[PDB]
Design an enzyme around this catalytic site. Structure first.
Site, PDB file in Angstrom:
ATOM      1  N   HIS A 118       4.382  -8.526 -24.366  1.00  0.00           N
ATOM      2  CA  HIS A 118       5.197  -8.458 -23.158  1.00  0.00           C
ATOM      3  C   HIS A 118       4.378  -7.943 -21.990  1.00  0.00           C
ATOM      4  CE1 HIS A 118       5.633  -4.067 -24.080  1.00  0.00           C
ATOM      5  NE2 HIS A 118       5.683  -3.990 -22.762  1.00  0.00           N
ATOM      6  N   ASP A 168       5.866  -8.749 -30.531  1.00  0.00           N
ATOM      7  CA  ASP A 168       5.268  -8.172 -29.335  1.00  0.00           C
ATOM      8  C   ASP A 168       3.923  -7.541 -29.690  1.00  0.00           C
ATOM      9  OD1 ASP A 168       4.985  -7.344 -26.719  1.00  0.00           O
ATOM     10  OD2 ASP A 168       6.120  -5.485 -27.024  1.00  0.00           O
ATOM     11  N   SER A 265       3.848   1.179 -22.164  1.00  0.00           N
ATOM     12  CA  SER A 265       3.906   0.072 -23.116  1.00  0.00           C
ATOM     13  C   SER A 265       2.515  -0.540 -23.249  1.00  0.00           C
ATOM     14  CB  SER A 265       4.922  -0.986 -22.668  1.00  0.00           C
ATOM     15  OG  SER A 265       4.704  -1.355 -21.324  1.00  0.00           O
TER      16      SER A 265
END
EC number: 3.4.21.41
Length: 314
Positions: A118, A168, A265
């Site tokens: 992502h 992911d 992230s």
């Protein structure tokens, strides 16, 4: 004569005999830039009467200095919203990412940066900017970005499905490998399913978005692997229909005040394997809801280990 010895990448050689003299009975001892690199397996070579540089067991072939993973020089001290600023050498593998926005990753081997899919293909959506080898953001900027040659997003990941973070995880091959140091070292990969035992404390370092201000320096927080079930409840409890597969895992707790946030992230969930005193990347900071709250989700790296090896095995 034998001539000058071949140069040992990521290592060097020293003369045990008169320096610079490459003739019969000449003796040099090769060595690797430890602890950043380790010699594959005794570095002793001599100028054989055949006029060749040879080691007692091999000879014609010089050693290989391979990169050492998960063995940081300056480990973290036991006593991102939730505070605490990381010190140089604590996480030599932390990578600074700025593709679509600030993000993180982890150096693998010597020329691969592991991160979140992502992070490359965001939900509801660029120059692949990557920096490494430093704690302070300005510095990484000055150090310059590291050109990317390949990009390898896992097949399962899907961008159009904003509430499904399955798969992911991605890989970034640096154009040119780097030189490891106390402030830039790869992390190891998990190999035992136990790296997910409940209550297990792992670390998440990043340049996220702490409480009220932007972070000018890398920060970290320690989180415990939470019970799936509990997370599975909490999640449906709030009526969320997000995907939460066996290929993921949760950490933190709704009552915890320490957590990864906006900008962390892609970063990694690090666990110091007590069995070998080496740090492994058990997860990838994938997604959650809010920040200070509780229960964060991470890609179960252990399940992509093979996929990763293949991608970087080339």
């Amino acid at each position: 004569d034998c001539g000058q010895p071949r140069n040992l990448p990521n290592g060097d050689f020293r003369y045990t005999t008169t320096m610079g003299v490459n003739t019969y009975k000449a003796r040099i001892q090769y060595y690797c830039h430890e602890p950043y690199y380790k010699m594959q397996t005794q570095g002793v070579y001599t100028c054989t009467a055949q006029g060749i540089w040879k080691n007692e067991q091999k000879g014609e072939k010089i050693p290989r200095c391979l990169p050492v993973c998960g063995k940081p020089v300056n480990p973290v001290e036991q006593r991102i919203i939730g505070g605490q600023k990381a010190k140089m050498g604590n996480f030599p593998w932390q990578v600074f990412t700025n593709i679509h926005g600030r993000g993180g990753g982890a150096l693998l081997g010597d020329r691969w940066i592991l991160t979140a899919a992502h992070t490359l293909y965001p939900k509801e959506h660029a120059s692949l900017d990557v920096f490494l080898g430093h704690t302070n953001v300005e510095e990484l900027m000055k150090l310059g970005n590291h050109p990317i040659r390949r990009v390898s997003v896992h097949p399962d990941y899907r961008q159009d499905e904003s509430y499904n973070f399955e798969g992911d995880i991605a890989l970034l091959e640096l154009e040119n490998s780097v030189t490891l140091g106390p402030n830039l070292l790869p992390i190891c990969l998990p190999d035992n399913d136990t790296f997910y035992d409940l209550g297990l404390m792992g670390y998440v370092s990043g340049f996220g978005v702490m409480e009220e201000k932007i972070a000018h320096d890398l920060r970290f927080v320690r989180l415990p692997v939470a019970n799936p079930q509990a997370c599975e409840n909490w999640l449906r409890g709030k009526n969320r229909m997000d995907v939460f597969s066996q290929n993921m895992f949760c950490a933190g707790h709704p009552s915890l005040k320490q957590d990864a946030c906006q900008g962390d992230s892609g970063g990694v969930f690090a666990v110091r394997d007590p069995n070998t005193d080496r740090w492994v990347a058990t997860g990838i900071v994938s997604w959650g809801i809010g920040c200070s709250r509780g229960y964060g989700f991470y890609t179960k790296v252990l399940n992509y280990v093979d996929w990763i090896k293949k991608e970087m095995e080339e």
